[PDB]
Amino acid sequence: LVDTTEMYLRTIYELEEEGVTPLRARIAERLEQSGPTVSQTVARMERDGLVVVASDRSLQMTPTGRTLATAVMRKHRLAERLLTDIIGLDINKVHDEASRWEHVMSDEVERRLVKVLKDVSRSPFGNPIPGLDELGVPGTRVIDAATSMPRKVRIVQINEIFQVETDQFTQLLDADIRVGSEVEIVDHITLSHNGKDVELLDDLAHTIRIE
Amino acid sequence: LVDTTEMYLRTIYELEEEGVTPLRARIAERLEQSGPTVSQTVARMERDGLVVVASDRSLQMTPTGRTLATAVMRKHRLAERLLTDIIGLDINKVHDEASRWEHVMSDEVERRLVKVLKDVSRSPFGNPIPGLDELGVPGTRVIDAATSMPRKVRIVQINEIFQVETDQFTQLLDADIRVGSEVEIVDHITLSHNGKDVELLDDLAHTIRIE
């Protein structure tokens, strides 16, 4: 959705990037929004813990706000590469188009673009694409990657070191399941490897990363 | 923008298409919206002249509503072709992704997709893509295609038959400007052809179609 919050966050991100101090009036100018409206929006965002207004009245993105800002910027810039490299849209319109697509591109689409685009290091305008790490350029836990429909994934991490339950270690070993091993999930949770099914225990499901 | 109105309109369009009678409760079911909310939305849409509720309580899209419904469906289906043919997104997610992109795809992006996609006749799900005519598969008048920055376009129509002013007919002829002739617009309005500049009069600007 075209969250205004996503918009304010990418704006603060751009300002820092250009080296400007993210002051409310600057954000108001660029967003073409009024001063009374931006302060009202920053107010809501502060209460949500997305940004904190410092003594000097500059806006400090909190770690979460920054994470969200980064994702919005990555999508925005990935959309710009898609629109100029693949679609061939007019360079003079790419920015505005991207400003809208950033709010509706899913992470799943982003991971794919990363696969189909020749170069994802910079946008057409010469700015680096932030947060590519979250797209494989540590991972999703099977518990929330738990598709009821089987899917061939790859183990990024097991986290045996965080296991209190050690019954399923040998089972993983027997099923040739390890880090870098492509398995198949269908969610309690079950992950197969060569017809070998390991019905995971909660702890394992909460820590094993299939990305 | 994710207009809810665009959403209700595509919904009514799908129902007719499947052959179902567009009754409010059906729309409420599919949209996963409440009965009191849909009737409130149809109410606003009726006042806007987008749909009329018939005696049998079925919803009749007015010519304008239908035009808007068609455009939303074309974009939606073009997005589905883009997501499966180019991006390679998982078939099971293409629909939902498209349901969001339909509200942010510009017509300019649609005309380009029509150029880059191998087949635009049907969506991946086997439904025909409606309204391709508005994308060249009669045109934009120079008055509203009047970019202050020069752009090479193509005359689709002159409409001499609608001209009260006949001073610029020979000028068009002299500048080798006719239907199917690629010119360049920069907007009063001026359109060139081989270094020949014809500063158009309002009437001409209001009827000449450069698409």
From Swiss-Prot, chains A, B:
Gene that produces this protein: dtxR
Functional description taken from the UniProt entry: Iron-binding repressor of the dipheteria toxin gene expression. May serve as a global regulator of gene expression. Represses ripA under iron excess.
Pfam families: DtxR, Fe_dep_repr_C, Fe_dep_repress
GO cellular component, one term: cytoplasm
Family membership noted in the UniProt record: Belongs to the DtxR/MntR family.
Superkingdom of the organism of origin: Bacteria
Subunit organization: Homodimer.
Compartment annotation: Cytoplasm
UniProtKB keywords: Cytoplasm, DNA-binding, Iron, Repressor, Transcription, Transcription regulation
The organism of origin for this protein: Corynebacterium diphtheriae (strain PW8)
InterPro entries in alphabetical order: DtxR/IdeR_SH3, DtxR_MntR_Metal-Reg, Fe_dep_repressor, Fe_dep_repressor_sf, FeoA_core_dom, HTH_DTXR, Iron_dep_repressor, Transcriptional_repressor_C
Protein name: Diphtheria toxin repressor
GO molecular function: DNA binding; DNA-binding transcription factor activity; protein dimerization activity; transition metal ion binding
GO biological process: negative regulation of DNA-templated transcription
Residue ranges of domain HTH dtxR-type in the record: 1-62
